[PDB]
A paper describes a structure:
Pannexins are single-membrane large-pore channels that release ions and ATP upon activation. Three isoforms of pannexins 1, 2, and 3, perform diverse cellular roles and differ in their pore lining residues. Pannexin protomers retain structural and topological similarity to innexins, connexins, and volume-regulated anion channels but remain as single-membrane channels and participate in ion-conductance and ATP release. The PANX isoforms, PANX1, PANX2, and PANX3 harbor substitutions in the residues that control channel gating and can have architectural differences that form the basis for altered properties among the three isoforms.
Author numbering:
A (entry chain F), B (entry chain D), C (entry chain E), D (entry chain A), E (entry chain B), F (entry chain G): 26 to 158, 194 to 355, 362 to 369
Write the structure that this text describes.
C-alpha cells in the first residue's frame, strides 16, 4: 500500500509495448475508417449474388491451401495477410506475460522487504532525534551476498528484449512485402464443380485492408525500434543506480557510517534501484536532506 | 482476508487453462476479422436469392444427417466443424469446475487453520520478546497423521491433468483433419422436392471458418502441451516444499526446537506449501530472519 | 452477516440447475455460431423476394395449426421445435423458485437462531476460560421436539427433485425425435389465395436450428441425470450429519456433557447440518480442537 | 433501516405480478426466437420490392380502420393483435402502482411506530433484567380504536385483486380467439389508387407473432389464476395473525400481563402482522423464548 | 439530509406527468412493436429502388410545404403527424421545469427553517423532560405575516395546471383527427423534374405510425384528465392542513399553549403542510402522542 | 492529496490540445451526420452489384499504389485523404505523451517538496502565534542553485510547442489541397483481368468525406494557431511569477525577512510558480494577508 514496487521506466515500457499492438488491432478494423470486407473477387456478370458470395467465401477460406490459388509471391504472404491481427495479439500477450510473472512472483517478496527497511530507517531517525536532545546496514550486507532477485530481473528484461527483437524482425519482414501480394488468382473447381463449364476457371481476388496492415506494421516496427535501446539500457542495473541515497543518511550518528554502494551486480543493486524511487516518499528523507545540504546538532535538534 | 489461500503456480495454471479457450472462442467469430457465414453452397444462377438461402440453410442443418450429404472423410469431421466453439466452451467449463470445487470445499477449512497458526506464531514471538527482556508444534504433529486434504489436492490436480490430456488428444485429432473436409456435397431432395426436376441433384457446399478453427486448435494444443508438465510437477507435493521456513523459527527458545519437515506425503506437506507463500506476510518472520542470518540475545532484545 | 446460511452442496446444485438452461438458451441463438433464421421454405423461382418472405412467415406462423401443414410425425414435434427456448426458460424459473422460497421464508428464522447459538457457545467458552484460572443444551432439546423446519427442507428438496425428473423426461422425449421432424410441407391457401392458380399447392419447409436444439437437449438431459443422485442423497438429512461437532465441546466442564446427536429426523438434524458448516468459523472451535486432540487443565489455561 | 416494512407474501405477489408481464413482453419480440416483422401481405409478382413494402405498411397501419379490411371475426381481434404488448405493459404498471402508493404513504408512518415499539420492548426487557438481579400496552390499546391503516391495506389489496381479475378476464377472452383471426383481407384503394387497374383489389395479409401472443396470454392467465387465491387469503388480515408473539412476553413481570390479541379488525391487527415478521430480529425475543419454553427467576437472571 | 422537503402528492404528480410522456415517446418507436419507416409512397413498378427511395424521402421532407402535396384535411394534421414525439418531449420538459425551479429556489430556504424548528421542538421537549423530574411560537407568529413562499407555491402549481390543461387541449384536438389524414397525395415536380414525362404527376403516400400516435395521445389525454383534479385540490393549501400536529404539543407546559392553526392563507400554512409530513420523523412526537392519548406528570416523567 | 501539482494554464492547454483531435475524429465519421462509405466509383450498368463492390474495394485499396490510378495532384493527396484520422490520432497521442512524462517523473518530486514547504510555513506561523502571546529560507537558497527541474519544464513546453507547430504546418498544407483531389481515375487491370475486354479500362472514383476532413483540418489549424501564443508565453517561466507571495510573510518576525524573489531562471522560479497556485489553500495565508493589508501585534495576537 503506497509503494510503487515497479520502476517508472519499466512501467512505461510495458505500457507502451502492450497498448500499442492493442491500439493498432482496434484501429485496423474500426468501422470509423474501415471498408466492408477483407477479400473481394471478380466474378462474371452472369453470376448471381449468391454465387459471387460463394466465390468470395471460397477464395477467402482457400487462402490456406496453395493447391488452388496461383499467386506470384507464394502462399506465405497470403497467410500473413489473413492472420495479421492474430499475430499482433499474440505479440501483445507475449509482451504482457513477463510483467504478470514479475508481479505474481515478487510483489510480496519486495513489498515486505521495502516496508521493513522503511520502518528501520524511520526508527533510526526517531532514535537519533530523541537521543541528541545498525540492523539495516547488516541486512544490506546480507543482501549483497544473495544473488537471486537481480538474476530474475535481468532474465525477465532479457526475454522481453528478445521478444521485442523478434517482433521487430517479423514486422520488418512483413512490411517488406511487394504490396502486390494482396491480389491473387483463385479457383473454385473442387468436387462436383470440376466438370461443369458454367464457371470460369480462375477468379481474380484482392485482399483488402493490406495497405492499412502494412502501415500499422511500419508504425509498430518504428516504435519498437525506438523502444529497444531503452530496454538495452535497463539491462545495465548497476549503472542505473546513483549511489547518493545513503550518503545523506551517513550524517546521522546512530546510522552506520560509510554505507556500501550499489556496485557488485547483486540483489543489493536491485534493492538500491527500488529504494531510490521510494525513499522520496519517506518523511525523514527530506528532513535530513535539508540539514545535510545546509551543513549541525542545532539544526538536527530544531526538527 | 489478506490470505492468498491459493498457490501462485496453480492460480496461473487455472487462469491460463480457462482464459485461453475463452479467448479463442471470442476470436474465432469476432467480426473484426471474420467473414459473413460459416457455410456457403453453390446454387445455379436460375435460383433466386431465397432458394439459394434455403439451400445454404438446409445444407447447414443437414450436416448432422449423413443420409443426404456425400462427403469423403465421413460425417464426423463435419460434426466437429459445426460444433467447435461448443466443444471449446465445454473444455473451458470442465477446467474451471475443479477450482470452484476446491474453493467451495476448502476456503474456510484452510483459512481458519492458517489464521490460527499465524496467531500462534505471533504469540510465540511476542512471548519470546517479552521474556528475554508449544501448541503449534503439537498441532503440526496432529496434522501429520491426518491424511485427508492432500488426497483431495492431488485428486483435483490429477483430474485437471486428465482433462488437459484429453483436450490435447481431441485438439490434436481435430487439427490432423485433411483441411479439405471443410467442403462436401449436399442435396435438397427430401419430401415433395424429391420428384421435381427444377433443382440440381447435388450442391457443392463449403464450411467457411475451418482454417481459423484449425489454427485455434493448434494454438490451444501447443499451449496445453507446454502447460501439462507444470501440472505434472505440481502433482509432486512433497518435492515442492523447501524445508526452511521453520528452521529459522528454531532459534527462538520458546518455540519447540527441531521442527519437523514436510516429508511424509500427508496434510502436513500441504500446510507447509500453504505456509511458505503466506509466512512472508508475517511481521515477525523478517524480524527473526535478520537475527538468524546475522547471528544473539542482544539483537533479539534490540527489536 | 458472515453466515453462509445455505449448504455448499445445495448452493452448487441450484447454481448448476439454474445456470445451465440459461447457458444453453444463450448459446442456442448466439450469432457467434448461429444462422439467419429458424425456418426456410422453398418457393418457386417466379416468386419475388416478398412472396418468398410471405411464404416463410406464413409457414412459421401456421406451425401451430395442423389444418394447413402435412407433416409425418405430427404437429407436436413442430410445436416443440418452435418453443424450445421458452420451455428451457420455464424449467430454469421452476428450478430457481424454490431457492427464493427458502430464502424469503427462512433467512432470518435460521440467522437469528444461528447467531444465538454461536453467542451461547462463545459465552460458555469464555466462562470456562475465566473459571479454571446449559442454556444451549436445553435449546437443543427443545428443537428436538419441534418437527417443522426439516419438513420444509425435505419438501423443497423433493419438489426440486420432481421438477428435475420431469425436465429429464421431457428432454429425453424431445431428443428422441426422428431428426427429420425439422422438415414439413406447408401450404398458403387461406382466404383469397385458395382460388388462384399462380401459387403452388404446397411448399417444402425446414425448421433450421433443430440439430442444435437436440444437442442442447441431450447435454441438459445428461447433466440433470448426473445431478439427480446428488439431490436424492441430499434428501437423507440425518445420514448427512457427522455427529462429531459437539463431542469436542463435551470436554469443557461448564458445557453439558453427553451432548445429543442429530439422529431422530427432526429440526435438530437440520440445525446440526447448518452448524457443521458454520462452526469452523468460530474462534473457540479450533482452540478447543487442539486441546481435545492433544489431550488437560494446563493446556486449557494456556490459551 | 433493517426493517422489512413489507410482508413476504405481499412482496412476492407484487414481484411476480409485475415481473411476469415484463418477462412476457421481453420474450414476445426477442430476436433470439422471433421473426422479422408482425405483418406479411401477399402481393403479385409484378410488384416491386417497394410496392410490396408499401402494401405491408399500408395494411399494418389500416388495421385500425375497418372500412378497408374485410375480416371474418371483426376488427376487434386485429386491434388486440396489434397492441398486445402495450396492454401487457399497461397491466404491469397498474399492478405496480399500488405498491408505490403504499410505500410513499406508509413507509415512515410504519417505520417510526415499529422502531418506537421495538425500543419500548427493549427497555422493558432491560428493566426486567436489571430489576430481578406499561407504555407499550397502552399504545396497543390506543391503536385498537384507530381504524385507519387496515382500511388502507385492505383497500389496496382489494384494488389489486380487482386489477388481477380484470386482467384474467381480458387474457382469457384474448386467448379464446379463433387463431385464424391473425389473417385478413386488406385493400390499398384510397385516393388516387382507387381508379387505376394495375393493383389487385384485395391483398391477403397475415399477422405474424399471434400464436406466440396467445401462448404468452395463456401463461399469464394461468399464473394469475394461481395467484388470485393468495391475494384472496391475504384480504383476511385478522385470520393471518397467530396470536402468540405477545403471550411469550407476558412471563415478564414488568410487562403488562394478559396482552390483547389481534382480533377486532382494526389497525392493531395490521400492527400485529407487521410485528410477527420483525420481532424475530429482536435480541430479547429469543432470550425470552428460551426461558419461556424451558420454564424461572434463576434462568432469567442467568442472562 | 433526511428531510423529504417535498410533498408526497406533488412528487407523485410530477413523477407521473413527466414519466408518462417519456414512456409514450419510448414506446411509440420501439423496434419491439414498431414498423420500418413512418412514410410509404406508392411509386410505379418501372421505378428502381433508388427512385422509390427518393420519392419516399421527398414526400416525407415536403410534408412541411403545402404547395406540393394535395391533402384533404390541410397541412396542419401532417405537421402534427411528423412532429408528435417532439411535441410530447416539449410538454414533458415544460412539466419538469417548475419542479427544478422550486428545488433550486427553495431547497435550502425550507431545509434550514425545517431543521431549526425541529431542533427548537427537540430542545423544548428536553427542557420539559429535565424540568418535571417560546421561541418557536414567536417564529410561527412571524411567519404568519410573511406572505411570500405560499405565493410562489401556488404560482408554480397554477402554471403546472395551465400547462396540463393546454396539453390536454392539444392532445384532445390531435386525437380528434379524421384518422384518414395519415394519407395524402405528394408530387415530385420541382426543378428539372417538372418537364420530363417519365414520372407520374402525383404519388399516393401514407404516414405510418399514426394510429399508434393517436392511441398514445388518447392515453396521455385520459391520464392528464384524471390528474388535473389532483392539482386543482392541491391549489387549496389551507384546506389541506389538518390542524392537529400542534394541539398535541400544547399538553407540554414549557411549550406555548393555544398554538395557532394554519388558516389565513400565508406562509404559515405552507410551513404547517411541510411539518405534517416531517413531524412523524421526530422522536419526541410519538413519545408525546402516547401520553396525550392515554391522558399525566407520572407518565411524562416515566420516559 | 489536495495539491493541484499542475498549473491551470498548462492543464487547460493539454486538455484542449488532446481533446480537440479526439472530438474531430469522433465527429468525422459519426453516423449522426456521415454518409455510407469513403469511396465511390462509377461502374457500368452491365456490372452486377458484386463487380461494382469489387471495383470500389480495389480502387480504395489501390490508392496506395500509383501505378494503377491516374490522378492530377499526385498520390500524396490521396494518401492523406485515406489516413486523415490516423494522423489526427497520432498528433493527439504526441500531444498527450509529455504530460504523462511530467506526471510520472515529477509527481512525487514536487508533491513531497510542496508538502514539506507547507508544513514549514505552518510551523513558522504557529511559532509566531504562540510566541507573541529559518529552515524554509535556507531551503529556498539551496533550490536557487539547483538548476534541474526548470530545465525539464521548459524542455517539455518547448517540445509540445514544436509538436503544435508541426501539426499546424501539416494541417495548413492539407487544407490547401485543390478540393478536387478527392476524385481520381482508377483501373482494375491486374493479373488475369488485364486481357479481357468485358471491363472498362478506367473507372471514375471519388473519395467521399474529404470536405468534412478539410473543415476539421481548418478548425484544428485555427484552434492550434490561437493556442500557440499561450505556450509561447508559458515558456517564459520567470516573467509569469508575481513576486508577492513571500513579501506578505516578511511581516512575521520569526520568518526570515527580505525573502528572495523568483528571478534568476532556476528551479526557484518553478517552485514559486507552483507555490502561487497552492498558497491560497493554506489557512495561515489569509490570516496573515488580513493583518498585512490592514496594518500590528494586537491584531496578530487577536487570531
Amino acid at each position: 500500500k503506497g509503494l510503487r514496487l515497479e520502476l517508472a521506466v519499466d512501467k512505461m515500457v510495458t505500457c507502451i509495448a502492450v497498448g500499442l499492438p492493442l491500439l493498432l488491432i482496434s484501429l485496423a478494423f474500426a468501422q470509423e475508417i474501415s471498408i466492408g470486407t477483407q477479400i473481394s473477387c471478380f466474378s462474371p456478370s452472369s453470376f448471381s449474388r449468391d454465387q459471387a458470395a460463394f466465390v468470395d467465401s471460397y477464395c477467402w477460406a482457400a487462402v490456406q491451401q496453395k493447391n488452388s490459388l496461383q499467386s506470384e509471391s507464394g502462399n506465405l504472404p497470403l497467410w500473413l495477410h489473413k492472420f495479421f491481427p492474430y499475430i499482433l495479439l499474440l505479440f501483445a500477450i507475449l509482451l504482457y506475460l513477463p510483467p504478470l510473472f514479475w508481479r505474481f512472483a515478487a510483489a510480496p517478496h519486495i513489498c515486505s522487504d521495502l516496508k521493513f527497511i522503511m520502518e528501520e530507517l524511520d526508527k533510526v531517525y526517531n532514535r537519533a532525534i530523541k537521543a541528541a536532545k545498525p540492523i539495516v546496514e547488516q541486512y544490506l550486507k546480507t543482501k549483497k551476498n544473495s544473488n537471486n532477485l537481480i538474476i530474475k530481473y535481468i532474465s525477465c528484461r532479457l526475454l522481453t528484449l528478445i521478444i521485442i527483437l523478434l517482433a521487430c524482425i517479423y514486422l520488418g519482414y512483413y512490411f517488406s512485402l511487394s504490396s502486390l501480394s494482396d491480389e491473387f488468382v483463385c479457383s473454385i473447381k473442387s468436387g462436383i464443380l470440376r466438370n461443369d463449364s458454367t464457371v470460369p476457371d480462375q477468379f481474380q481476388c484482392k485482399l483488402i485492408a493490406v495497405g492499412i496492415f502494412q502501415l500499422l506494421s511500419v508504425i509498430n516496427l518504428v516504435v519498437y525500434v525506438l523502444l529497444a535501446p531503452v530496454v538495452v539500457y535497463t539491462l545495465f542495473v548497476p549503472f542505473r543506480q546513483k549511489t547518493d541515497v545513503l550518503k545523506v543518511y551517513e550524517i546521522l550518528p546512530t546510522f552506520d557510517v560509510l554505507h556500501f554502494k550499489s556496485e557488485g551486480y547483486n540483489d543489493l543493486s536491485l534493492y538500491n534501484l527500488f529504494l531510490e524511487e521510494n525513499i522520496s516518499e519517506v518523511k525523514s528523507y527530506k528532513c535530513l536532506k535539508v540539514l545535510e545540504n545546509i551543513k549541525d546538532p542545532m539544526l538536527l535538534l530544531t526538527n
